């Protein structure tokens, strides 16, 4: 689980690095990158989905 944990946080914090450097005036931006990717019916886009 230790190796699976570092693999997940390293994947997330790397991508949030190059997501923070996009202008709001765009299709896939800071606020609306979760909605277009998700093709299901979750209650709220939070927790494990993001």
């Amino acid at each position: 689980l230790f190796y699976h944990s570092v693999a997940m946080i390293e994947s997330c914090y790397v991508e949030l690095g190059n997501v923070a450097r996009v202008s709001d005036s765009d299709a896939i931006n800071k606020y609306t990158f979760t909605e277009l990717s998700v093709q299901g019916r979750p209650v709220m886009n939070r927790g494990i989905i993001v």
Binding site: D24, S25, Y31, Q39, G40, R41, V43
Partner: protein
Amino acid sequence: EPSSGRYTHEDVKDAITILVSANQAYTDFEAAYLMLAQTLVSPVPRTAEASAWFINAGMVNMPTLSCANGYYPALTNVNPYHRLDTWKDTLNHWVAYPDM
């Protein structure tokens, strides 16, 4: 948090950008954008006779404020319904170039 009292014009942009993104109220913003384009400026009359337009006060029809997203957040999810595919263009234009 409790109200501070003071705010910069930059802070109002942050308030609008969050409120639209959370509520998915992109078409509601497009209505407000066109509604302000009418009011923002008024003509200086060409001749003295053209002052007749601006004597009587024109009425601005503001819709009643109602929303039920806070109570039932299940109805607003990741797959929203939109009629046009260019339904987020007006906000993306304003947030980039406000003075336009």
